[PDB]
Nucleic acid binder design. Structure first.
Lengths: 120, 257, 204
RNA sequence: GUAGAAACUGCGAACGGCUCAUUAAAACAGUUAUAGUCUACUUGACAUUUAUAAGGAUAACUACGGAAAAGCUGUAGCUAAUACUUGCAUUAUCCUUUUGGAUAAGUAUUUGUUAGAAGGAAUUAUAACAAAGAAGUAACACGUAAAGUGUGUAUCAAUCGAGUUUCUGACCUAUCAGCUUUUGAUGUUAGGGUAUUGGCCUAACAUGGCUAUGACGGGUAACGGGGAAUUAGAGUUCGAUUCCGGAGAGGGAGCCUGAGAAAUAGCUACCACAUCUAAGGAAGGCAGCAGGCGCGUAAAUUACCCAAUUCUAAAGAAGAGAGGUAGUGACAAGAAAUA
C-alpha cells in the first residue's frame, strides 16, 4: 500500500541515549497501518540497520480515520533498549517473555510468613 | 503523631511549577537543601516538565543514577533536589550549561549559558555573622556560608562566586543605580535600576525600581537580587531581558507573526 | 519433671524425665542459682551437684530471678528484661511469669552440673563438643594461637577449603585510609592558613 | 569473587488514608512576634582538656524443653559488627624586622566581673578575666581522574517543619444580668517546671479581672476557611465532603521509644462490648480498603495493578487497598439516534 509518515517535535536525548519524537501517520481512505510498517518506514527514513531498537506507543486513530498520532523512541542499541525501558514495554516489543503473574498473592504470602514463624 | 508532612498534593504545589491538575494526585516534595520549596523547583520537574528529557519520575531517576547532571559544578543524585533561584546546571552527556532564572511571568526557566559563564554564579548575601576570633561569614540566599568575606560587603549586597574554588570574585552594592531582579512579588522577574529606597522603622522597607522603559514598580526589600551596576547585568538574561509588557500590547505582538 | 541437665564444660546436655515426687523433694523451696545435691533423683547421679538455673511452670510460663514467690505473677516487661521479646523499640508489655521458688508446678526444670560425681553418664560427661565455629576477631585468634604480631593469621584459620574472614586486620587499605586522612587534615590546615592569610591581606 | 535464607544493626512506620463526635473568641482566616523556643533527613561551612589498630557480650545457629493455645519462650555453648565500650600529635600569638628565639592552649551549656559588625530597640555577635563542663574531633566500609564515595560525628547557618504569640473577624437566645475570686480568679515578688514565655505550678502579698458595645450561661439537627446555590444591585441560604488548618481512632486516663507521638493496624489500666480456652490462661479495636449486621428515605466490588503520581528504605530492581484501573452507578454534567 501507501502512506505518509510525519515526525514532529523531534529531539535527541543522549542522557537516555534516546531520540524522542511524535508520529503522525497520514493514511487517507484506508485503515490504520500496523506498527511493523511504520517501523520499517522509520528505519528507512533514519537509516537504521535494525528494527528492534525503536519503541512505539500511544497510537490513536483520531476521528474520521485517515490519521494516527503516536510517540516513538529511537535507541542507540538493544542493550540500551533493555537498560532504559520498562518490562511491560519490552514484553510489548516481544524482546522478553512474561514473568510470573502471581500478583498480590505474594503480599498475602509475605504477611502469612511472619518472621520466626516460618523457620525457612 | 504530628511530625513533618512528607507529601505534596498537586493543587497544593507552587503555581510556577505548572503541574497539571489531572496528572496524578501528588507533587514531588522537594528535599530540604539550599533553597526554600516555594522559591525553587526540584530537578525532577526541571528535566521532566521543562527540558522534557524524562517522561516519568523513573526516567528522572534513570538520568540521575549516572552522575551526569551537576548543580553548581557538583554531582546531585537526589530526585527532589531544590535547584533554586539562580545557579548553574551542567549536563555532561549533552554538554549543556543552564542558569536557573525567572521569566517576566514569574516562572523558573533554564537559560542557556556558555561554558565560560557557567563558572560565575551570583549569590545574594542574607546575613553577616561574626564567629569566634572576629571571623566573618556571609550567609547567602543559596543557603551557603562564605567565611572571610571582604568587610565592605553588606547585608543586602551580592557577591560573584566561583563554583570551582568557592571563592568570592567581586561584590556588588545596592545604590540607586545598581540594577536588580525582583524574585517573589507581583513583579517577580522584572529587571530594573532601583529608583529609590524607603526605609520604614520597624516594618518592611520598600524600594521603587525603574524599568528600561521608565516604568516604576515598587517591591519589598527582601524580594530583590542585585545583578549588576548601571553599566550592565553581570549575568546573561532570558530573551525578554526582564522586560514585562502590558497585557493589552503583548496581544498585538502575539498577533503579528 | 523433664529435668534438662547441662554440662557446659563438656558443651553437652541430657534430659531425664522423672515422675516420682520424693526424688525431686530436696529441690523444693530452692531459688534459681541454688546448688543442690542431685543424688535422690537416681543411683548414678549420686555425687554430682546441680545449680537450678530455670524452668517452666505447669502452664508453660517461665521462671525468672527477681520474683520471690511460689506462684505466677504479672508484671511489666522492659526492653532489657530477660523473659521478654519486644516487638518494637521501647515497647513494654505485661505478661504472667512464675516465681523463682520451685514447687510441685514445674512442667520442666533446667539445671547445670557444677561438681563432678563418682559415676559416668553416657553422652553427659563422656564426650565434649567444640566451639562449632572459630573466633572471628584478629585479637581473639592471636590470643588462641599465641603468635604475637609475627605474621598474618589468615592462613591459620579453621574451615569446614572454605574459611571465614577476619576482622580488625592490618590490611594495606586500612593503612592507606589512615594515611589519606592524615594528609586530608594537613591539606585542610594549609588551606585554612593561606585563606586567612589572603583575608588579612585584603583587610586593608 | 559472585550471590545469599535467618539474625543483629540502621532508617521508616509521627507520612499517608478515614471521619466530623467534641468545639461559640475556642478552632479557623487574614495579619504579626518568637529580641521567649525546639527542629530528624537534606545543604554549606568546618573541631577542643597496642596505633602496621584495643575490650567483653549477644542474636542468628546447635542440643535439651514446657504450654490446649498466642507475633510465648527457659537453660547450656560459641561467634561478629557503622550494636555496646575504651583509647594514639599540633596550632595560634610577641619581638629584633623571607628569618631565630620567646608565650598560650575546652565545642555547646551554666555562674560571677567587665569591654562591646548588625538591629528598631541588646543583657546582640564577639572579646577579656575567674570557675565548672556535656558531647565530640573516624580503632568504620566500597572505589573516580587516560585524588573519590558511603556511613558517623561538635558547633554555626540554611532548609523541611513545629510549639507558643499580636491585632481584627462568627449563628440563635435576656422566659440567661451580673459573673470570676476558699478549688488561680486579676496582678506583683521569688522560685519550680518547660524547648522556650506565661498562674503553667508553688509560697508570700495585693484586690483585682470581665460585663447591656450582651459578660456569665443556654441552644446549635455547629469543625472553620478556600468555596456552593440563588443573584439587576443589595441580599438570603448552604459549606460532613478534592485543598488548607483542627480534632479523634469504642469512652476516658497514663506512658515507652523517638528529632518528631501523650501514637492507638505502640504499650498500661479502668468502663462498655467482644474472641479462643482442655477452664489453668491468652487475645481485640475497620471514623484505612473491600465486605457484613444494624439503622434507616437515604449510598457501590470481600475485583486488578504498582504502569502513571508520589512516599519510605540499606533508595533503579522492593513495597504502598496511598494512588491508579476496571465493576455497580438515570447523583450531577456534555454531545447526540428514533430518519
Amino acid at each position: 500500500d501507501q502512506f505518509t509518515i510525519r515526525v514532529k517535535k523531534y529531539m535527541s536525548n543522549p542522557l537516555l541515549r534516546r531520540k524522542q519524537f511524535a508520529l503522525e501517520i497520514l493514511h487517507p481512505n484506508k485503515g490504520s497501518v500496523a506498527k511493523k510498517e511504520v517501523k520499517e518506514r522509520l528505519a528507512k527514513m533514519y537509516k537504521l540497520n535494525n528494527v528492534n531498537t525503536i519503541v512505539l506507543f500511544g497510537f490513536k486513530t483520531l476521528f474520521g480515520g485517515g490519521r494516527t498520532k503516536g510517540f516513538g523512541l529511537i535507541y542507540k542499541n538493544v542493550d540500551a533498549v533493555k537498560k532504559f525501558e520498562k518490562k511491560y514495554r519490552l514484553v510489548r516489543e516481544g524482546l522478553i517473555d512474561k514473568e510470573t503473574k502471581a500478583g498480590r498473592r505474594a503480599s498475602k504470602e509475605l504477611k502469612n510468613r511472619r518472621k520466626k514463624v516460618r523457620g525457612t | 503523631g504530628k511530625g513533618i508532612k512528607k507529601h505534596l498534593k498537586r493543587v497544593n504545589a507552587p503555581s510556577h511549577w505548572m503541574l497539571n491538575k489531572m496528572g496524578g494526585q501528588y507533587a514531588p516534595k522537594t528535599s530540604s537543601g539550599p533553597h526554600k520549596l516555594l522559591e525553587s523547583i526540584p530537578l525532577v520537574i526541571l528535566l521532566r516538565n521543562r527540558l522534557k528529557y524524562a517522561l516519568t519520575f523513573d526516567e528522572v531517576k534513570m538520568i540521575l543514577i549516572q552522575k551526569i547532571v551537576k548543580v553548581d559544578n557538583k554531582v546531585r543524585t537526589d530526585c527532589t533536589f531544590p535547584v533554586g533561584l539562580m545557579d548553574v546546571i551542567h549536563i555532561t552527556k549533552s554538554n549543556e550549561y543552564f542558569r536557573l532564572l525567572y521569566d517576566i511571568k514569574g516562572r523558573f526557566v533554564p537559560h542557556r549559558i556558555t561554558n565560560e559563564e557557567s563558572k560565575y554564579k551570583l549569590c545574594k548575601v542574607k546575613k553577616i555573622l561574626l564567629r569566634k576570633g572576629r571571623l566573618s561569614i556571609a550567609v547567602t540566599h543559596d543557603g551557603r556560608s562564605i567565611p572571610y568575606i571582604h568587610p565592605d560587603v553588606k547585608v543586602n549586597d551580592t557577591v560573584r562566586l566561583d563554583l570551582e574554588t568557592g571563592k568570592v570574585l567581586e561584590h556588588l552594592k545596592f545604590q540607586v543605580g545598581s540594577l536588580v531582579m525582583v524574585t517573589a512579588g507581583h513583579s517577580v522577574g522584572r529587571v530594573g535600576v532601583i529608583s529609590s529606597i524607603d526605609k520604614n522603622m520597624g516594618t518592611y522597607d520598600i524600594i521603587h525600581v525603574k524599568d528600561s522603559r521608565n516604568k516604576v514598580f515598587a517591591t519589598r526589600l527582601s524580594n530583590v537580587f542585585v545583578i549588576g551596576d548601571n553599566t550592565k547585568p553581570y549575568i546573561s538574561l532570558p530573551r525578554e531581558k526582564g522586560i514585562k509588557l502590558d497585557i493589552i500590547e503583548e496581544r498585538r505582538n502575539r498577533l503579528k507573526a | 519433671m523433664k529435668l534438662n541437665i547441662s554440662n557446659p564444660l563438656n558443651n553437652v546436655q541430657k534430659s531425664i524425665e522423672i515422675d516420682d515426687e520424693k526424688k525431686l523433694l530436696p529441690f523444693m523451696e530452692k531459688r534459681i542459682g541454688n546448688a543442690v545435691p542431685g543424688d535422690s533423683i537416681g543411683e548414678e547421679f549420686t555425687g554430682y551437684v546441680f545449680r537450678i538455673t530455670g524452668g517452666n511452670d505447669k502452664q508453660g510460663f517461665p521462671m525468672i530471678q527477681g520474683v520471690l514467690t511460689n506462684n505466677r505473677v504479672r508484671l511489666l516487661f522492659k526492653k532489657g528484661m530477660k523473659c521478654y521479646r519486644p516487638r518494637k523499640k521501647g515497647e513494654r508489655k505485661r505478661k504472667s511469669v512464675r516465681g523463682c521458688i520451685v514447687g510441685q508446678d514445674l512442667s520442666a526444670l533446667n539445671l547445670t552440673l557444677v561438681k563432678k560425681g563418682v559415676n559416668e553418664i553416657p553422652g553427659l560427661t563422656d564426650k565434649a563438643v567444640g566451639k562449632k565455629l572459630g573466633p572471628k576477631r584478629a585479637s581473639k585468634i592471636r590470643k588462641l594461637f599465641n603468635l604475637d604480631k609475627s605474621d598474618d593469621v589468615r592462613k591459620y584459620v579453621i574451615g569446614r577449603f572454605i574459611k571465614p574472614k577476619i576482622q580488625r586486620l592490618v590490611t594495606e587499605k586500612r593503612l592507606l585510609r589512615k594515611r589519606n586522612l592524615l594528609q586530608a587534615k594537613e591539606k585542610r590546615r594549609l588551606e585554612k592558613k593561606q585563606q586567612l592569610k589572603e583575608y588579612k591581606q585584603l583587610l586593608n
